[PDB]
C-alpha cells in the first residue's frame, strides 16, 4: 500500500499517517486469500496418504 | 453531568474507585484509548467515569 | 601541541577506490570536528565533508554524495575517508584539518572557530 | 576573576557496556496490565 | 477415548475459536479510527468546535 501510493516519498508517506490504519486491513485481506488458495488444492488432491 | 477536568471535556457519572495512581499521574486510559477514570486537582482523589 | 600526521601518495587507475587516513596525537580527538579539504593543481579550496567522532554522524557535500565515505576510530583515534568511483578530475592534494569549537544542535553541525591545526597534505594522481 | 586550571591534556577516555538502562515515562497516563 | 483426545489436545475446537477473534478484532480498528486527524487539526468536535 505505501509504495503504491507514496513512491519513496517522505513528505508523502507523513501525510499518509494521518489516515489510520487503512492499508494493513488490506494487506490483511490479501494475505488471508493467499492462505486460502492453499487449502483449496490440499482438500482436493490429498486424500490418500 | 458534563465535566471539564483541567482540559477534559466529557458527559458522565462519576464515582470513588479502588484504583491507585503513581503520584505524577492524571488520568487513565482503557484498551481503546478511551479515559476510564481521572483525579481530582484539589482533593488528589481517583474518580470513574 | 595537536598534531595530524596523513599517509604516502597514491596512484591510481580509473573506476577503483582509494582510502586515506589521518591519525592526531597530543589531544582529547573526542569532541573536534574533523574535516576534509581538497586543493586541485593551479586551482583553489573545496570542502567534502566531516564528522565528530563522539557523535558519530557525518556531514557530506551535495556535490560528493553516494561517492565518499567519511569514518573514526576512536580506540586508535584515526579518521578514514575513502573516495569510490574514480574519475579523471580526481587528481588534487587533500587536507586534514581541524575545527576546535563544534556542536551539534540538530542532526546537523553549528561551527564556532574556524580551522587552525592542518595536515600535511596527501597526493592522488589517477590515470592510465 | 578566572584561574586556568586544565594542563597536558592525554589519554582519551574509556568505554562501557550499557545493557538495558536509560527507560523514563512516555506520558502522563496510568495503564495497568497492557502491552504498549 | 473422546473426552480425552478433546480435554488433552487443547487447540480440537480451532474452528469455533476462530470467528470469536476474527468478529472481535475487526470491531477494535473501528474504535480507534475516532483519534484521527483525517487532514484537520484535532479529532476532537468540542475542542474545535
Ligand atoms: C487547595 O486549596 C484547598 C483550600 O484550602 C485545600 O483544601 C483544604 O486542605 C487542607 C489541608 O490540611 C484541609 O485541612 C482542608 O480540609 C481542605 N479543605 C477546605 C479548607 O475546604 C486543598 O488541599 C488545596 N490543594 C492542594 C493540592 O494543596
Known amino acids: 500500500c505505501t509504495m503504491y501510493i507514496c513512491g519513496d516519498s517522505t513528505e508523502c508517506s507523513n501525510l499518509l499517517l494521518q489516515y489510520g490504519s487503512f492499508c494493513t486491513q488490506l494487506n490483511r485481506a490479501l494475505t488471508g486469500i493467499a492462505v486460502e488458495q492453499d487449502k483449496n488444492t490440499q482438500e482436493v488432491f490429498a486424500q490418500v496418504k | 453531568v458534563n465535566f471539564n477536568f483541567n482540559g477534559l471535556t466529557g458527559t458522565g457519572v462519576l464515582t470513588e474507585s479502588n484504583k491507585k495512581f503513581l503520584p505524577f499521574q492524571q488520568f487513565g486510559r482503557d484498551i481503546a484509548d478511551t479515559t476510564d477514570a481521572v483525579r481530582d486537582p484539589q482533593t488528589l482523589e481517583i474518580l470513574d467515569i | 601541541q595537536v598534531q595530524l600526521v596523513q599517509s604516502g601518495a597514491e596512484v591510481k587507475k580509473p573506476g577503483s577506490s582509494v582510502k586515506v587516513s589521518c591519525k592526531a596525537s597530543g589531544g582529547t580527538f573526542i569532541n573536534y570536528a574533523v574535516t576534509w579539504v581538497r586543493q586541485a593543481p593551479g586551482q583553489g579550496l573545496e570542502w567534502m565533508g566531516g564528522i565528530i567522532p563522539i557523535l558519530g554522524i557525518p556531514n557530506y557535500a551535495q556535490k560528493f554524495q553516494g561517492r565518499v565515505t567519511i569514518t573514526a576510530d576512536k580506540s586508535t583515534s584515526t579518521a578514514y575517508m575513502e573516495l569510490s568511483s574514480l574519475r579523471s578530475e580526481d587528481t588534487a592534494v587533500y587536507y586534514c584539518?581541524?575545527?576546535?569549537?563544534?556542536?551539534?544542535?540538530?542532526?546537523?553541525?553549528?561551527?564556532?572557530?574556524?580551522?587552525?591545526?592542518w595536515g600535511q597534505g596527501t597526493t592522488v594522481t589517477v590515470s592510465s | 576573576q578566572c584561574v586556568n586550571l586544565t594542563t597536558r591534556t592525554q589519554l582519551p577516555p574509556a568505554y562501557t557496556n550499557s545493557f538495558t538502562r536509560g527507560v523514563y515515562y512516555p506520558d502522563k497516563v496510568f495503564r495497568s496490565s497492557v502491552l504498549h | 477415548k473422546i473426552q480425552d483426545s478433546l480435554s488433552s489436545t487443547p487447540s480440537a475446537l480451532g474452528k469455533l475459536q476462530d470467528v470469536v477473534n476474527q468478529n472481535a478484532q475487526a470491531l477494535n480498528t473501528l474504535v480507534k479510527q475516532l483519534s484521527s486527524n483525517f487532514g484537520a487539526i484535532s479529532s476532537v468536535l468540542n475542542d474545535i468546535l
Open positions: 584539518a581541524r575545527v576546535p569549537q563544534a556542536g551539534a544542535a540538530q542532526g546537523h553541525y553549528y561551527y564556532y572557530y574556524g580551522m587552525d591545526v
